[PDB]
Amino acid sequence: STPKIIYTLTDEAPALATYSLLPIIKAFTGSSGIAVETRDISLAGRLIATFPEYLTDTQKISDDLAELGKLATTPDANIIKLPNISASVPQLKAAIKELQQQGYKLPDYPEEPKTDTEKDVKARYDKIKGSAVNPVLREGNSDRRAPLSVKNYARKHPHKMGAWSADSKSHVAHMDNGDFYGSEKAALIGAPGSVKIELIAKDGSSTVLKAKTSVQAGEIIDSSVMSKNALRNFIAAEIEDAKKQGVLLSVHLKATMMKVSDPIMFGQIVSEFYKDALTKHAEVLKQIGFDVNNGIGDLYARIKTLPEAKQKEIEADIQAVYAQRPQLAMVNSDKGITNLHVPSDVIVDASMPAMIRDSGKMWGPDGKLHDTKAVIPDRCYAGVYQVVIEDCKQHGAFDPTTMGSVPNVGLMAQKAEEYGSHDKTFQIPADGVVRVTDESGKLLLEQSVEAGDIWRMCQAKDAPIQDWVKLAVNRARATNTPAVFWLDPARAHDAQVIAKVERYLKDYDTSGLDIRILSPVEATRFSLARIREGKDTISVTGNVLRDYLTDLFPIMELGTSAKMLSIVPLMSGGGLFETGAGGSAPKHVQQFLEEGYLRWDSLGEFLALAASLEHLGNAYKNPKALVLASTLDQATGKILDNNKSPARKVGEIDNRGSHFYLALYWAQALAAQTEDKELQAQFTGIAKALTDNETKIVGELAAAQGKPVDIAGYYHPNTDLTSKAMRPSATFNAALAPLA
Ligand SMILES: [Mn+2]
């Protein structure tokens, strides 16, 4: 019956931080009638939950991801979601190995299943790897923006911005035709039903690609195709031009999430770039099972089984290739790891803003920065980035001390658009035409295709879209800031969305508001003009642009996309608060294990918690929760103003130290506020204890630094050892003891 806040237990860095912060949260929220429950969505937990039949009664655990998904569609849900692993196969195997060493008899991951058991096992493991969590929890749209506190702090403490030259040779390179953008076709579903996706080959034959896909009334579905011939010709031409202009060739895709389309596109780029070597050694590469879609790094891993004489020859022919091609942007120049080694190394949402901020440059083989030709094949979003680059060439770097802000209202509920296209993406087996028909046999979408092409279909439902418009009007009204819908009338999909947006906007009183619809490129130019004059503009966009813009603007404005709000007003009425948009920082864990220092910044957790408390306070009419939220806002502001966030080496406060300061400031705020006497009385002694013991506590926390830390594991560490290491201050622990 007590109102609950679900706190996700995740992986690596945030997981460690949670052992320190969660106890604090529980202690501060207890007296206000709030309960905090955890749900395990860690890679290891999701693996264990999936194979109960291979486990002892005591090893089994509840399937918390499924539980959360159900919760996300309930009216009173209140979830705080921290960053987590979207596992690569290597991470998956590593986690499986660790668990087996711990006694969990999980089956091995079979990369090439040849038995009923292996096939069943691989299918299940495949649903666990990759971006498995977000699609389940995101049952609402996105309200992502940096808090005013963070913006104001950035304004006063400007981060470094690479200077821009009007002579910069950097730019985005995209196809002119033959891409998804140029072939998009859409249809508006009239009534409930389902569609069939079939390939009608030239040889007359027919192949069902996906027999059934349920569709709702008012749902928008669209098909598009990336032409293999056009992509290859585009790549070949850009390779030559990069070499001619003397710039680094870089590639910006979203391989981990766009698990079907992007690795294929990545592979086609790798194939054309290294064609002389790959063709020459075609037979032996097939023999060792080389998978070009997994990058050239896959070749280096698999050739280690061939005679040393062969490895030598192959590696030499690869070097001959590099001498004939333009230089590649590097992920790690010292180790010779290029942009083409691993598909998941360079991720477009973070890589493009990083490049734009750093003078439009990337690392070259020499370990220095150089201008670059950023390849983003498809035209749908490539233009947005080009506009930013041109803006910087003409106006110079952005000025964090005066620039405005561009928050985002994004459409993502129910795996909207590209995010739910994976099971409807197919590499075409043979020339023909793909047809999408409904149950009555009506032809909804028809696309001519060639063998090797990438065909895909996306879906966008009406309820998500109406809620998305509602959210946009809400934000515009709350901030009295102009809002712009980024929709391209030339795209069949966007055109269908525009029709809905124009209709739904009429469902609101927008009299004193400034709302408009512009194509992505026009929207970008409009927003950048306003941002440089210090004005704000709300970007209202689809799922992918939500992803891109919420990394892009925070990077320019704040120098980081790790300090902000990612509020998800669940369509069922609940609230989901994501603490961070990034990864779980494996490197932070490495430093912690090596020298007992955790540099993870929990600011996002503090921000999300305040939003969660406010949500609970309003939903349950709990006055104390609202006071807890207000005082936490103050404490978080002091963390920023008094510079109590983690440092980087050893000696200074780390993640644990920042949590102490949060507790200190929060308790002090609670003891001084005049809205709730019971909380004031209760936290007076707590504030005194933390205040009087600041030096002693900070010292005990610092004493836990400087030595190796062993928590008996990585993906599934011993909880007692981890808890001990993350809560080393007996004085701090004792100070919160009275809390109930
Ligand atoms: Mn992102």
Swiss-Prot record:
GO terms for cellular component: cytoplasm. InterPro entries: Isocitrate_DH_NADP_mono. Activity is inhibited in the presence of Ca(2+). Its cofactor is Mg(2+); Mn(2+). It is an enzyme of class 1 (oxidoreductase). Its EC number is 1.1.1.42. The keyword Metal-binding applies. D-threo-isocitrate binds at residues 131, 134, 138, 144, 254, 419, 546. SUPFAM superfamilies: Isocitrate/Isopropylmalate dehydrogenase-like (SSF53659). It is found in: Cytoplasm. It comes from the Bacteria. The keyword Oxidoreductase applies. GO terms for molecular function: isocitrate dehydrogenase (NADP+) activity; metal ion binding. Optimum temperature is above 40 degrees Celsius. Pfam families: IDH. Keywords: Cytoplasm, Glyoxylate bypass, Magnesium, Manganese, Metal-binding, NADP, Oxidoreductase, Tricarboxylic acid cycle. Transmembrane segments: none annotated. NADP(+) binds at residues 84, 86, 134, 584, 588, 599, 601, 648. It catalyses: D-threo-isocitrate + NADP(+) = 2-oxoglutarate + CO2 + NADPH. Mn(2+) binds at residues 349, 547. Monomer. Belongs to the monomeric-type IDH family. Consists of two distinct domains, a small domain (domain I) and a large domain (domain II). The structure of the large domain repeats a motif observed in the dimeric IDH. Such a fusional structure by domain duplication enables a single polypeptide chain to form a structure at the catalytic site that is homologous to the dimeric IDH, the catalytic site of which is located at the interface of two identical subunits. Catalyzes the oxidative decarboxylation of isocitrate to 2-oxoglutarate and carbon dioxide with the concomitant reduction of NADP(+). This is Isocitrate dehydrogenase [NADP]. It comes from Azotobacter vinelandii.
